[PDB]
Amino acid sequence: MIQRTPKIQVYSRHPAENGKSNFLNCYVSGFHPSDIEVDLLKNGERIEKVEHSDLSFSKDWSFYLLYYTEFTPTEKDEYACRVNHVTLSQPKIVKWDRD
């Protein structure tokens, strides 16, 4: 039995302009086994109606997939991606930082 921890990358399709509609993405990859819990948060509360791509795997057989949503950034709205998986002692949060 091999287990692999997910890598988690969060990013927007377009540069963030406050008050312009955009797509927030959370790509989770390199994980095994496939059972996983992903959420997008807005100020720490989970967004519903999040879509995701069909589950796939790489050449090394580890799984990957894309969770995304329509969203509208503002000066004082914080967005993140929360991931839970059997390799993780607790859920892992990565913040969307426009940089």
Place this chain on the structure above:
Amino acid sequence: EHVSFHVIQIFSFVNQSWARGQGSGWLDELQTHGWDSESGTIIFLHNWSKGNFSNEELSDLELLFRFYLFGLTREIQDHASQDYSKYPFEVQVKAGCELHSGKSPEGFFQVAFNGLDLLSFQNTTWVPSPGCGSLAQSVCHLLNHQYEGVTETVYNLIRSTCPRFLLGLLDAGKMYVHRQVKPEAWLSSGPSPGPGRLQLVCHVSGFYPKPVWVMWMRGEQEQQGTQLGDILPNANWTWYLRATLDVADGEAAGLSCRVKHSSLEGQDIILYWGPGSGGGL
């Protein structure tokens, strides 16, 4: 060069009566097919995803998949129910074909168990992966000497139906597969690497097809220390990529990100840094 069509299957066995099947069809790295587990049907993602195949023959394929998924699952459940401490466990299958200029089509059918290679279909033989356990030898034995209906079907699907389908699919999707989608680009100031250091960031987004070239530059001199992220998907069938560079606070001036992409027709995107906080004015 090289072109391929393939099916992936993902089987999760949680206990002796609970398992989950999912899968999907792919043109190299482009997804062309879904599978609806609920109804046991193919989900055709693009308007060209049927290729040149008749509905009858697709409907025949869909029924042959339904029978297989249920049968493979039930046979696994028969073996594994004899020891409930084997659960949970995962089996992955990748099956299809690949064409090389001037060759006969090559077929593959590769199996993993709990994230490692377990076995593969090599010509007309099922062969345990190098470092073959007991498990892998037992299954290959079962496949080679008593499921001969199976092996023949498999053979003919990967060696003859797949290449045929593949070429219909590429023909019907020609326009879409070779289209060009231009990227945008932008800069930002990522997290401080240290004292009087800056991280310059160049984002490139919305590009198709996937190959792309991004470097930080000073005029003609490529900046050695440039770090390419992974190329990540956007949800509208394009790609995303960040390129970074760590510079002395005070060397940033004069530096630019340059993008080359096949959709730009030799007209590279060039973004100069600075003097504002985040590479703006």
